[PDB]
Amino acid sequence: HVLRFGGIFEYVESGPMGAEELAFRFAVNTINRNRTLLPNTTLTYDTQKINLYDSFEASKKACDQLSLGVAAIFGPSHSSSANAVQSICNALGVPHIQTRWKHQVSDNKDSFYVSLYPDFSSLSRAILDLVQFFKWKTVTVVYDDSTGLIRLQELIKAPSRYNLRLKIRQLPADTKDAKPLLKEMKRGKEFHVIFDCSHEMAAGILKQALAMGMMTEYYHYIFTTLDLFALDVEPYRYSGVNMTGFRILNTENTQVSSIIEKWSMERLQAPPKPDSGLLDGFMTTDAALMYDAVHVVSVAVQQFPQMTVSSLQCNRHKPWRFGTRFMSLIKEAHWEGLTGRITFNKTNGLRTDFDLDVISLKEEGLEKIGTWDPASGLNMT
């Protein structure tokens, strides 16, 4: 017998498939040829690509997927788009796997969805543990206009409870060239800065700081991006400026490095032109979460043989039969994947418990100087 999974991946200028969709087509292709998981069960899926910034179509696409009969739905990888699919799912009691952060309203009354991306509310605490660690008196968090500062609410609470003069500043989401921004920072002796943006935007700022002469041992930047390790810090590793961040990818394991190794022997998406400053050869965390998004569910489904993909119909139908339950099996399932150990909270469902690896910028490049976790605090070296 076979099971039909979901699949919603927005188009990309790269090629036929983005690094996101590839992670899915690669995950549901390893489980089959591996008796370790889902022995007497074969997996299939329905690919449904949509447009960027398009949620309307995303609704009719996700709905059509439920019409063909599916047990779960993956993607899309956009805030608005996935926000729509999330509702259609919780309305028809169908699991909605997510591998990317999205602006979720605090009035979220949904219950059928799970996010593998490290909860930013619990990730912000990891940042604060570094601030107090470096006896920081002041700091200036600079977030991107792409998303509000709600994602950093915990950082804004520190000045109230903890002793720290935080200052907010916004990055020009228009272009990466923001001289005037770095200008005022050097005028206010703002040496302590915390950049909140992906490895793309982040690299676009480092190139500017070097041109601003703000790259010295006087400055110390902390990035929220989990793709810090995948950043060409060659032109800066000789400078002296310190850099700290996190990495959820447990590359300190053979079983983990083995998968990523076979991933680089497939690119499809040709390596981006050397302009932004990305170190080609390392898999992005965006695709890492998608590989673990399939496993975390493949374990919850194996322990629930009594399940048949029913053909639902949005706008007018009734919740899925084996839905309210199959979702509970996912919010309790654990799996040791690429992004460390997976474990959803026993309440909100969001993944607030995980393992990160503190990394700094030494004279050689980027090395791990410790680890972090919600249970323990900070174990440095």
């Binding site: 309307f56 926000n83 729509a84 709600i150 804004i156 000045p159 720290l164």
Partner: protein, 371 residues
């Protein structure tokens, strides 16, 4: 043969805000000129703030001959969804309520943008030399609606500290911590409910004295009656847009005052809701722009749908006429700018008292002016 327009309302009917009634009162007045095409307004109730549920509603509005869509006014998610569809249908969207996280654009809003609201609170603190600020955020969105304010000033115990209220956790330890940091100024941000509640357990801590100064961002301040929690020395500011300059204002308040204990007499009538106020002027603004567009180009509405990729030809046209609008309603001057926000309007800062309210000052869309 008629000027139709949908109105996605999420308001209740039993002891609600009186929005479904606000629209009716508007349509009646418009059809009191006798002499052209009539003006009909379709109402579309909403159950729960959900993208899913709202999408189904729009596929019932398009098939009809609509010109514009009003509301929701208390449904953040259900509001953003309507904008997205209205954008790919060229059908103007009169937003009048929530506003979060601002590509296809085609809609105007009467409700004060999060920029003007934050700029207003900033101008108020100006006349106090920016004392020790300490906003009592009620939710997470409290940081977005007041984004321009939080970024404006440094974040610390001596300039501005933010404290969020956990759900089912109430405003208890909060006000306490404020007393520890000898904070005087406090700016609460929540609905009319939490606004009355936070100050309640506050006044019983000497927080109601003249020593402290509060600033409510909630627009439901004129209806927020504080009985047994306020004093003669207390300082509780607020905001309002109700312009008494409109001769129909007295009649408007009359309809809601009676209808309240006429259908749901299980409580007293607080006062004219801000939601109903926006709904009223909204209908007028729409018919106003269409009236001008019917002078230049014959306006024909052809049934659309969610399946068809068709758009309303007179969409972009009406959008320009909904930009050059000049209507004096129960909210002041109704004018829009490039982006589509409301400008050139006043923002009377009211202050509670022993009985009623007292206009202490006013905030313009260019400069502040109190006393």
């Amino acid at each position: 043969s008629s000027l139709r327009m949908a109105a996605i309302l999420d308001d209740q009917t039993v002891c609600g805000r009186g929005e479904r009634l606000a629209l009716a009162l508007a349509r009646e007045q418009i059809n009191g000129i006798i002499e052209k095409a009539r003006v009909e307004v379709d109402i579309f109730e909403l159950q729960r703030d959900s993208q899913y549920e709202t999408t189904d509603t729009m596929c019932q509005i398009l098939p009809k001959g609509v010109v514009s869509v009003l509301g929701p006014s208390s449904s953040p998610a259900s509001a953003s969804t309507v904008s997205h569809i209205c954008g790919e249908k060229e059908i103007p969207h009169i937003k009048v309520g929530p506003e979060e996280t601002p590509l296809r654009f085609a809609s105007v809003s009467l409700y004060p943008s999060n920029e003007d609201v934050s700029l207003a609170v900033s101008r108020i603190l100006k006349s106090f030399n920016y004392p020790s600020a300490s906003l009592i955020c009620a939710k997470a969105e409290c940081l977005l609606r007041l984004e321009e304010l939080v970024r404006g000033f440094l974040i610390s115990k001596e300039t501005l500290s933010v404290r969020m209220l956990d759900d089912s956790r109430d405003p208890t330890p909060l006000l306490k911590e404020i007393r520890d940091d000898k904070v005087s100024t406090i700016i609460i941000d929540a609905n009319a409910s939490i606004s009355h509640l936070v100050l309640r357990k506050a006044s019983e801590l000497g927080m109601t004295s003249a020593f402290y100064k509060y600033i409510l961002t909630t627009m439901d301040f004129p209806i927020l009656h504080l009985d047994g929690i306020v004093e003669d020395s207390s300082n509780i500011l607020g905001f309002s847009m109700f312009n008494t300059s409109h001769p129909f204002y007295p009649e408007f308040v009359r309809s809601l005052n009676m209808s309240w204990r006429e259908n749901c007499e299980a409580s007293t009538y607080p006062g004219p809701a801000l939601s109903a106020a926006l709904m009223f002027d909204a209908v007028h603004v729409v018919v106003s722009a269409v009236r001008e567009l019917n002078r230049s180009q014959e306006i024909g509405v052809k049934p659309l749908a969610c399946t068809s990729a068709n758009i309303w030809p007179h969409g972009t046209s009406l959008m320009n006429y909904l930009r050059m609008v000049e209507y004096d309603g129960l909210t002041g001057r109704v004018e829009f700018n490039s982006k589509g926000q409301r400008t050139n309007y006043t923002l009377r800062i009211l202050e509670k008292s022993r009985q009623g309210h007292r206009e202490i000052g006013v905030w313009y869309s260019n400069r502040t002016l109190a006393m």
